[model samples]
Target chain A: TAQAMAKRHATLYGDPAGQSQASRIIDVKPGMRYVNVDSGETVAFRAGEKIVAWTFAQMVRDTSVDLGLLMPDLPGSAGVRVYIDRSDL
Target chain B: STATAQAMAKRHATLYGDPAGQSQASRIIDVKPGMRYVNVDSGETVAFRAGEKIVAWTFAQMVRDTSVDLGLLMPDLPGSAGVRVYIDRSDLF
Candidate 1:
């Protein structure tokens, strides 16, 4: 399941599915990216905290889609963290 | 947050298309004796059921990552479900 585009582990934008990529979209679900505050310089996420995912469910829809991440019991103070842009990319 | 004004918006979040599963984390919220607070995505209201545990969650923490690691475990989508609580139906007001 990790291989699925929705769960490819890469930030949605950095993935090959971005506008720069020529591949056609599968489900048409737009995605946002996120990382933890403790993640330091990189936006990569840590386990057990939170990741923010955002998107537009459809064309001309006013309510943007969103999902917040949560993981528990990691090596860090808040368990884990991830960076996220609530605005669709 | 839902006092129901003209400008209010209602969003729907259905887990598995029906009510989902939940286990309490051993915490209690104060409420009127007969009136119980059922926490829903919409907001607190009377629980649909009488006398039972409900799916729930508390904002344990919200922080930013400083040393972001690509190898770290990233929570997948459709897993960020929030908590729900149960209460007496008679308390619906």
Candidate 2:
């Protein structure tokens, strides 16, 4: 929990050609799909899909927002913001 | 640009305040070669396996240098600082 807050955030907004680490999974929920790379499982993407991931800016303050670090790999879909929580769950 | 800060503030407020606000968030533009994911407030790490599709949004941000950037918007708003988005992926579950 504390470790995630201490790390900076890094996410991918998914490429356009439907080729990237972020898969475009159609069944995924429309809400923020949070994933912890440190835990092993990562965001997915499919043909014309996208996903959003993030690392904590830091655990010291814990006063931050998703900002503009959106991630997803959808062909036409947009991206999602990334924020750092106190834990990685 | 004396009112640069003010104008920016207003723009941010409109983007973050209105529940229907939207943004033209660009795609990831890169591939890492594996399932990528993020951790939301629920403390759940939504994992994206190989061959899953999804989408999201990103707008209004300030990166103060590379270490300490603010993804959130300035002039603060009530709801999410960002905007709504849509995504799709088969292996989402």
Candidate 3:
């Protein structure tokens, strides 16, 4: 158990889209659909859609609030923010 | 202009406080692909995906924390209810 926890945390230390390597699977629980603020595209997943980290980060980059360089993204208000359900894999 | 800018900055900082108190938070978890959800209480919208990286904030914590149910707020089909989002636990927090 302890050893697995060690390996599980191997990839958790990071941020920003495209910054981290692809890992893990996440389900877009029924209810919400994603919207890309940059392109104005609404991303709707298939039933029980599961995705990896790389795909997830790239897709969520524009919609998320990333304070790039601790300086922040260009000043503008997006109609959306990125929120995760921390189920701890 | 100085205080005005400073005041506004403070407001933002307070909203994104570390060890969050008031309406701030200390953690944000990872979740689904190409996704967004609207908080019925604030009408604020947020998104998430696997491998998505973001700093912790009030809305982030609220959605990440399973105890905080966001299913009703999420736009599901009629009769659909609740979502349990599981994500990576950050070391930063």
Candidate 4:
């Protein structure tokens, strides 16, 4: 269901305040499904199929007690680069 | 550059020293979706994966985060003082 994907999306992109700043792109591999949390729409793609229209974000604000940002891609080469730190603010 | 992230990593290196020793003790174990708990004293668990790449640290790692000095991702506390942690590889995408 889209709702489930929405929750997962929130976890992935950190959209607690519904202020997710992301852009859709096409780069999915094969045998994977893309979920658009904002629209509650999910699309499946076959192997070697090019995925168009996907949400991409460089940062996510985590409201957890720690309170920090989640970088899905910071590796400059790897996707979803996980780099967390304390926010002095 | 956040710069702060580097500082955080440094603090971690100081606090926890090196993950090599811990990683040496760490081993991949079967896991489930959502949250899971572990007792560092148990000496039986290290990390977990729900399906394939959804890895999570054990309580031994969580206790380290109680201070929030290293933010919310990197491991901090070392030793056998009940700390746990986790990460979903799929989340990277």
Candidate 5:
């Protein structure tokens, strides 16, 4: 409806739910972030063309972890370029 | 960049950026065989009859998202139920 179209759009964060949940996360940032996992030392991730993978399930984000923005192509009346942090086994 | 040493760490790197000195986007993936996948979040259907090449990270995440969508059809802990089921991620790249 026009009203929905009129509704303000903002960047929403923190694991999208219901109508906008994403199973996996892709690092779409202009640049890459550094991360570490298991017993390994810190590492850097993917360039845009090369891309990098992260999942909502492995979330362990904080100021300390690399912050990744996801789902670049799709945008709402509000942009959904949200933050996610992932870590793993 | 050299990276990885874990379960998903290898998996994530394999899908997105294989750093084992592989060449020509070697780790890159495709839906070349032509498969149909419906995105759970947007309900959009997907495919690639051929000539379509995507990075493995994209394909892998899409696969995961698809599962979460299908999983939602069962009992959901509200909508939040979809994103986190288990912690099996493996990546340091």
Candidate 6:
């Protein structure tokens, strides 16, 4: 399921290569949840859940890595780095 | 002081090198409603909607201003220039 989810998410991020460019896969600790503000689809993982993060370049270049600049209401989960590419940006 | 601020600093060091390497700086001026703002200095206009927060910082301030440790480690990494962050609102699709 995680693999499928990751694959599905990869499309929303960037090219397939972007998934490989994804930062180190880490465990999704408790309180880890990311939502698609537009789709209203929210996914949460249990503590120690394994997941990968693909951080967007602009998100870093612009905010200096302040993800909150994109999702201010959500607190970042530890041990994770991911990028979600949006056509909008 | 905040998590977002902290994250930005770390990313700066990781990407451009280190904050100490910063030899220049810039500040965020006035912001227009409807998710749009332009850097008066760089003349780079960015767009965004409501419910998002914006924070801009010079390369130096990103690492050095955030913490003394970064200043001590002053690195000469490349791409450590200024940045303008446009936070998106979670409520939006």
Chain B TM for prediction 1: 0.19
lDDT (10s digit) by residue, model 5, range A1-89? 64333221212222223322333333323322222122112222233444332333344542222232332323221222222333334
Candidate 1 segments exceeding 4 Å error: A1-78, A83-86, B1-17, B23-53, B56-93
Q: Is candidate 1 or candidate 6 better by DockQ?
A: 6
Q: Provide the DockQ value for model 2.
A: 0.13
lDDT tens per residue, model 4, B1-93: 668876766566344222233344344433322222221221122333334443333332232323212123233322212223221112122
Candidate 1 TM-score, true structure as reference:
0.16
Candidate 3 Cα misplacement greater than 4 A, ranges: A1-21, A35-89, B1-93
Error of 5 at A87 (Å): 23
**What is candidate 1's lDDT per residue for B1-93, written digit by digit as tens?**
335521221112221122222332332222213331222221212112213433333221112211111111111212212222321112122
CA lDDT, candidate 5, residue A62: 23
What would the per-residue lDDT of candidate 6 be over residues A12-86, giving only the tens digit for each residue?
A: 432222324532232233332222111211222222433323343222122222223322223344323333323
Give TM-scores for every candidate, taking all chains together and pairing residue i with residue i: 0.16, 0.21, 0.19, 0.23, 0.17, 0.20
Model 2 gets an lDDT of 0.28
lDDT for A54 in candidate 4 is 26
**Candidate 4: regions farther than 4 A off:** A1-89, B21-23, B30-33, B42-93
**lDDT by residue for model 3 (A1-89), tens:** 75455434422322223323323222333333322222221222222332222222223222343221111222321222333222222
RMSD after CA superposition, every candidate? 18.4, 17.2, 17.2, 15.4, 17.6, 16.1
Error of 5 at A25 (Å): 4.9
Sort the candidates on lDDT, descending order.
3, 4, 6, 2, 5, 1
From the highest TM-score down, the ranking of the candidates is 4, 2, 6, 3, 5, 1
* Candidate 2 structure quality by residue, lDDT tens digits, B1-93: 848866765565444222221233222222123212222221111222122322222322222101111123222322222322211111222
Every candidate's DockQ is 0.01, 0.13, 0.03, 0.02, 0.02, 0.02
Docking quality class, candidate 3: incorrect
User: Tens digit of lDDT per residue, candidate 5, span B1-93?
Assistant: 333333434453334211121132212212212122222121112221113322211223222322322122212212222232221233322
Interface RMSD of each: 15.3, 8.7, 10.1, 13.5, 10.3, 12.9
Residue pairs clashing in model 5 are: A9-A78, B8-B90, B8-B91, B9-B90, B9-B91
Error of 4 at A11 (Å): 41
Can you write out model 4's per-residue Cα lDDT over A10-46, one digit (the tens) per residue? Answer: 4653333222222322123322211112222121211
Among all windows of 10 consecutive residues in model 2 chain B, the one with the lowest summed lDDT is: B62-71
